[model samples]
Target: STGSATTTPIDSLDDAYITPVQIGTPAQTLNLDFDTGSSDLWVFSSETTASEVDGQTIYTPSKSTTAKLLSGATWSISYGDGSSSSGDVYTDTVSVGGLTVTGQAVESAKKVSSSFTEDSTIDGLLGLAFSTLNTVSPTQQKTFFDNAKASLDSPVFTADLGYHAPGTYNFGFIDTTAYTGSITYTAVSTKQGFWEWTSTGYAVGSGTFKSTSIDGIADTGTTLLYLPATVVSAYWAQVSGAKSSSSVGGYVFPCSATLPSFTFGVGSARIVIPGDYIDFGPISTGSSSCFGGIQSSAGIGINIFGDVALKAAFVVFNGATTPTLGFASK
Candidate 1:
């Protein structure tokens, strides 16, 4: 009735998170990036260009007796970082944790951008966003969660992303021990195919909470938090020697500088992100300047509450007929 999976951080700063998934008849295991910002379950496969394959585990549908080609169906998707992939589709048995879904659409990568080839840890991606965002053509495809929700004990999943630690993603049930206090529920609009919601306001360290509405999406796929320039500037103004560096293309400060914790609201609930979490490691190996976890979303158009913010709290994604998001401190 439920499924649970462990998501491991790829880097010290929690740059990305990956989870193991089994696909096909004999079950080919692959470590996939569990992305909530987009929808499309694609994998590195034998269909991919040989030169593009790095150390990733590629799936060979030919070896799976139950693999069925979704004839004429194709998919192509691009990420915020500009990395992209395109391929044909296949229907197969897919499982995550212990949950299984038959006839799930599996996009087999035929071409991947350079960024994907360079990342040896990620074999592919498993999308968690709404099925509406799926890139499959001629016929859209449902995401793993969408396909598995009907059979689940409850149409919900929780994300407990950690800072430089392994976290758990539980489906159909929320782990009571995973968080503290009561979860505050907020309405979410899937109109844009994302878990989009509005934050009541934000606070810089012990400063006053600014009573303003900030529209953003909870994206586990993104590595950093992006807010309006005004909000970002307010936070950075508190730290000495902090500046927007053209070379770094973001706000950077002395690694030794004292930083302030950031707090954001989910309805009336307040989640505080520790100062250490904002000091995203050094710009370069052993560099004195460190990048800030919070950045400006001016150029990005819409604000994004990425892992930098998500990792600070326990998050619940309720997939009921009317979607909603719940947050609590951990």
Candidate 2:
């Protein structure tokens, strides 16, 4: 029902939030986003003058003896939420969780907005998710992975969510201690930046829709599963005796009893999502009774399997060894 992708938590420090990592000889720290959906490392800088950039913490490379600015160019990026940041390119040593990698690409923000500034806990995000949707341009030079490939022992990296906290996302060699049995490993598709998959069909409660095949990307950057309207409508139609009620910008059904279990097939592997996840209350304005498992995407292109689905499984993105993605238990 949803596609494959990656995500990471933003680490915050005092007034600034950054994915603080150690790099190089003296051990310099740089702010970065552990983004698996994309392959790159960027940060904000002192040159940023945007008035809307009031609350977020900006990292100063000048403060580090090992930091070096990329004198060739600058960059700006806008998200689907309409928020954006602009900064200059630079190179520095970065470290994550004690594992240090040298010669990492970083962005120093020249301009930022309050949306980013207000989050005191996170200075920047770490993109440990994937490599295809990297915000960095090919012409800009090299990706963070390109530099770290030599030092990573496994060539494969896994992201263990939930073990930490909301903002605690970890990266590096897959610690086999995290899983019990052999992991179900998926080969990374060389096509794009996202994890792509084909689903045989979907089942909500006891009702199953076998006629449709869903293809989309899994994304950690987004919070909700953006499903096609037709799929959502069809699933809700079979919600047993429960009628749809408006809440949190989505449809929700109240019941004292247990809700039906939902499952989606990825090839022969069937991933089932419990009812509680399906009943996510609405969060958007005006919309009521939204389905937690699925939401109206109008026409956003592809379905995104987000955190709700991710929380159910342990995901490993192997960057150190084979460059593949793996799934395992907590």
Candidate 3:
């Protein structure tokens, strides 16, 4: 009815979060990225080209008697970062934590991009975005969450993301102890097939909260927070030596620069992100220039409240017919 899983960051910079998933009859465990930005539960598999395979674990559907091919079904997905993958579909029992779905769509990757092949930390991605974003063809497939929601105690799931430590993901129930104060609820727009919502406004360090509506999606798959150019410029302006660099490819500043905290509103509640969280890392090994976690969304078109923001709050993805999003300080 309800379940919980541990989500661990793959690296020090929290590049990605990986959750262990059990697939098939004997339960072949694989580490997968629980992405809230995209749909389609895909994995590298025995069907993948030998040359493309790296240190990642491969799912062998043929080895599991319970796995059944979805005959004419196929899937392909492309990320905003340009990483892509395409594969055939199979129906098999998939388990996350203690939750199980008897017929979960398991996309077996036959081909993957260079970026995916090189990243051995993530075997594949388990999409938590709306099922409308699923890439399966011929007959559209339901996401693991969609299939399991009916049996869940409640049609909801919560994300407790961490900065430098491991966090937890709970299904069907909200853990009151996981967050502080009360959760601020907001309407979510599924029209764009994302967990999109509008924030009341934002503040720069100890500054006053601006009463502007900023629309964006809460994406766990993405690594940074991308906001309107004006807001991004304002935040970076507070730091000395901060500037947008074409050569550096984004906003970069001296490593010694003093970064300010960022605050975004969720209804009446405001979540504050520590200033140090903005300093992504150095431009290169031992470089004095540091990359910023908060960047301009001018080129991205849509603002994204990615890991940088999610890590500062406890997010709830409600799956009711009239879905809503909830945010609370942790």
Candidate 4:
């Protein structure tokens, strides 16, 4: 058994404060979105207007003393929410958390939306995930990891999510003290930059339905767990008098008895999510029936196990250490 203690203090800033990590010395600054779900760094610039964008950050070159644009190149992105943005490509030096990476490629949005334009605080997003979803061609695609890996002492990154504050996110070295036991590691697939792992099975209750098996990938970028509708319905059926409430759009039952435990098997590791997480109330759609954590996405190709699932373990993106992922506990 290996136990360690690591503590990351909360950094409080105004609703719109530039992180020291995103501010480079020599007055060179490129705006970025500190996104945990994806692992790509992008920016918006002078070419962007209030039309083809959404509630995102945009950068202003005039405001930066060291900004340069890459000619003859365009960048575009479409999010899961159906919003899109297009821009021209640029290059400049960028700094995050006091770590400087020079000559970084960026995107300056040509068309933006009111939501993006209105936000004068953040200029762009810095994706901390892997490089699988990068839009730039391999020859042109250069990520923060690609630039910073050689400079970091550990060649590793850890996200210290403030448990007390939902949006408080931290990056950089893993706190070795946060581990209480041995880590369960998984190999990273070479197909793309996506960090993926297969689940062996899932169960509801104290191993009562232990034999049932399921499989899916764990994705930290996603906000919700997208389980199969049949599996979700089946779990709800066993909740012993569980019912749907017309308040939060999920399942609910009497608060008296202890709800059953749900476990997801990943190789030799078995992770559990409390039954309470599944008991969501119905939203005020003026309808009495509602769904819980599990929702239907019939046309989607793969089911996703998002943030709700990642919170259970200490996850490590070892892009620097190896082409693999490391999982442990705090």
Local distance difference test scores for all models? 0.94, 0.55, 0.93, 0.54
Q: Tens digits of per-residue lDDT for model 3 on 1-330?
A: 988999999988888899999999888899999988898999999999888898999899988889999999999999988899999999999999999999899999999999999998999999999989999998888888999999999999999999988999899999999999999999999998999999999999999999899999999999899999999999999999999999987999899987899999999899999988788889899999999999999998899999999999999999998999999999
Please provide TM-scores, in order, for all candidate models, with all chains considered together. Answer: 0.98, 0.75, 0.98, 0.72
| Pairs with steric clashes in candidate 1 | none
Answer with 1 or 3, whichever has the higher lDDT: 1
Ten contiguous residues with the weakest lDDT in model 4: 1-10
lDDT of 2 at 223: 53
Cα RMSD of all models vs. native, in order, equals: 0.8, 6.0, 0.8, 6.1
**lDDT score of model 1?**
0.94
**Candidate number with the higher TM-score (3 or 4):** 3
Q: For each predicted model, how many residue pairs clash, with residues at least 3 apart or on different chains? A: 0, 66, 0, 25
In angstroms, the error of model 2 at 16 is 16
**Cα shift from native, residue 224, model 4 (Å):** 0.5
Clashing pairs in 3: none
- Residue-level lDDT of model 4, residues 213-322, one tens digit each, is 44445554454566766766666677666654445444555444345656766567776766554443334345443335544334355666665555556667676545
- The deviation in Å at residue 9 for candidate 2 is 6.7
